[PDB]
Design a protein around this ligand. Structure first.
Ligand code: 6NT
Length: 300
């Protein structure tokens, strides 16, 4: 049974997965993605160091492959991340001049989004912008541009492709009482009030065991920021307990603005956290109990 088909039947948009050319050309990954998932994300081929390893010298080979494969197989596409501190070449983080860095960031955003204009449902524009206490993370963009880099990034992205949904995303938004969760809600509220085009908040749910229960309260709190959409991203769960996975799916179903869920990978041995067996398929590419529990929850 396809969890994407079943979640669509319940009124959601997709059940998605992160992948790339390396996975799609090996094992049973392509067959499972074709059958069970409705949306794909490039894990690395759209990050800054992959796409602009030197300033103004772009590399789209891996991203083109993923986009073409998705279109050929009738899948939605999400992509990212345009602006964050991971996957960032040294030539960017060494820039000290505000005007220079603004133009560099705008060019990076505009070039990627223009190339795939109209083909991408969701762009993760800004990622991991917050510290755990709710203050803004001191990356090169904050250091050099200041807090205006977030409004600028979204305004630039909206101008490049008005069809795409623009997201801010972060991790450790899984508890309603945690300062980071409350901080991103308050800030996104202010940004939207000022007209910044933030269409969604994406929650990067790299979860410890037992954290699914808290998502039932955190996800509604994230929805209260008033963005058109919220999404669950990078989902995996240490131990892959059905109890955690079913709680995450129920939180999605309970929040009307939550459009779908994206899991971090297909099969455990391909996870960066493989030893914690945190995905929905095992090393033999067989569905695990958590996968069956999601299917059964969505049928009922
Ligand atoms: O949901 N995702 O698995 C995911 C993976 C990588 C990304 N980069 N930007 N947004 C992303 C989402």
């Amino acid at each position: 049974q396809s969890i994407d088909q079943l979640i669509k039947a319940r009124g959601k948009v997709y059940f998605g997965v992160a992948t790339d050319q390396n996975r799609l050309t090996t094992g049973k990954n392509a067959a499972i993605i074709k059958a069970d998932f409705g949306m794909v994300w490039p894990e690395e081929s759209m990050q800054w160091d992959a796409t602009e390893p030197s300033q103004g010298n772009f590399n789209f080979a891996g991203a083109d492959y993923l986009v073409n494969w998705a279109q050929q197989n009738g899948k939605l596409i999400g992509a990212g991340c345009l602006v964050w501190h991971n996957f960032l070449p040294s030539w960017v983080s060494s820039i000290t001049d505000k005007n220079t860095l603004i133009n560099v960031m705008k060019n990076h955003i505009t070039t990627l989004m223009t190339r795939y204009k109209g083909k991408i449902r969701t762009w993760d524009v800004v990622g991991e912008a917050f510290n755990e206490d709710g203050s803004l993370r001191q990356n090169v963009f904050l250091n050099v541009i200041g807090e205006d880099y977030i409004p600028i990034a979204f305004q630039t992205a909206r101008a490049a492709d008005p069809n795409a949904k623009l997201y801010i995303m972060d991790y450790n938004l899984d508890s309603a009482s945690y300062p980071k969760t409350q901080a991103i809600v308050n800030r996104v509220k202010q940004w939207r009030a000022a007209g910044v085009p933030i269409d969604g908040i994406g929650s990067q749910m790299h979860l410890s065991a037992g954290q699914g229960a808290g998502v039932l309260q955190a996800l509604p709190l994230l929805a209260s920021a008033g963005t058109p959409e919220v999404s669950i991203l990078m989902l995996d769960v240490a131990g892959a307990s059905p109890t955690d996975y079913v709680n995450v799916v129920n939180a999605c179903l309970n929040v009307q603005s939550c459009v779908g869920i994206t899991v971090m990978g297909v099969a455990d041995p391909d996870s960066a956290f493989a030893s914690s067996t945190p995905l929905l398929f095992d090393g033999n590419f067989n569905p695990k109990p958590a996968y069956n529990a999601i299917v059964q929850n969505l049928q009922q």
